[PDB]
Ligand binder design. Structure first.
Ligand code: HEM
Ligand SMILES: O=C1CCNc2c1cnc1ccccc21
Length: 289
């Protein structure tokens, strides 16, 4: 099963920079969403969930086919809440209908990370929408009620190692859980991309509690929370070393996250040898916009 990247006909960097800019301007505009968090976090999660269905064994799932647009995936219980992100991106796709769905969904994640003062994420175009019968079944995204061993084994399906896992999880600096979406009671939220997930894990006073949905979560005296899969990163000695590394090195975290996130978003895609180089988009701030 081979998915070959095919550049949207006649498009180049500046076309995609226009899409980035539209997403970025809408992020700035629609600032009230989710108690003034804005849409950055949910767009990052969307980009991860459209990519996280991938299976290295047969190259099913992944970001290439844009299949989140289909009911079966759109309605995956693991994707509850992501419809807000889809609706946010709707007007952008209407403005730029030439872009593929996979390209738009992944680019939304990139734009969100960057506009939230995260690292630059190189991004490649060429995902091509595939038919409804290519939509992966529900159940390929990870459970949150599990331990480090579950996390490690899960991510092997996505060809991610321990450092890549720990780095990717740092996106949980962002946003929050919503009891009605996932069965987890949200704590303090952020909308700036930092290494604070690691600092919170190491520095807060955590207590294991059972929430009103009957699920276990770790809660701090200051009002933050960790999923059991988050907290597993300080229960496992291999993960803990890396958590400490990122808590003590912002730049290393940024560089490792950027690599892992691009790789996550590109898993399953064959880029021809004469494909364009990855694009590094300028932020609104860098453009004076
Ligand atoms: C073991 C792996 C993971 C598990 C079990 C997990 C689970 C969760 C859950 C349960 C939520 C809350 C959803 C809601 O209630 O609205 C959430 C939110 C979020 N996740 Fe993850 N996640 C994992 C990995 C990741 C990765 C790899 C990324 C991206 C690189 C990511 C980015 C996010 C973001 C940005 C949010 C906040 C969304 C918002 O504020 O609406 N997560 N995750
Ligand atoms: O420590 C934080 C910061 C705010 N956001 C999250 C944290 C930890 N785990 C999370 C898990 C899912 C969504 C957001 C978070």
């Amino acid at each position: 099963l081979v998915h070959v990247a095919s550049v949207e006909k006649g498009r180049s960097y500046e076309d995609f920079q226009k899409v980035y800019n539209a997403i970025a301007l809408k992020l700035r505009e629609d600032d009230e969403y989710d108690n003034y968090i804005g849409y950055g976090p949910v767009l990052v999660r969307l980009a991860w969930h459209i990519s996280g269905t991938w299976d290295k064994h047969d190259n099913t799932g992944g970001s290439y086919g844009g299949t989140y647009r289909f009911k079966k995936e759109f309605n995956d219980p693991s994707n509850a809440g992501l419809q807000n992100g889809f609706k946010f991106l709707e007007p952008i796709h209407k403005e730029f209908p030439w872009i593929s769905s996979g390209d738009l969904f992944s680019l939304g994640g990139v734009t969100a990370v960057q506009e939230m003062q995260g690292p630059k994420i190189p991004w490649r175009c060429g995902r091509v929408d595939t038919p409804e019968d290519t939509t992966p079944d529900n159940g390929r995204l990870p459970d949150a009620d599990k331990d480090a061993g579950y996390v490690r084994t899960f991510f092997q399906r996505l060809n991610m190692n321990d450092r890549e896992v720990v780095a990717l999880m740092g996106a949980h600096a962002l946003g929050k859980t919503h009891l009605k979406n996932s069965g987890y009671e949200g704590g303090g939220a952020n909308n700036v991309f930092t290494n604070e997930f690691y600092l919170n894990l190491l520095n807060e006073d955590w207590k294991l509690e059972k929430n009103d949905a009957n699920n276990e979560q770790w809660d701090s005296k200051s009002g933050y929370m960790m999923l059991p899969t988050d907290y597993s990163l300080i229960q496992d000695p291999k993960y803990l070393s890396i958590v400490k590394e990122y808590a003590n090195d912002q730049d290393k975290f940024f560089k490792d996250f950027s690599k892992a996130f691009e790789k996550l978003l590109e898993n399953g895609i064959t880029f021809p040898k004469d494909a364009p180089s990855p694009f590094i988009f300028k932020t609104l701030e860098e453009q004076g916009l």
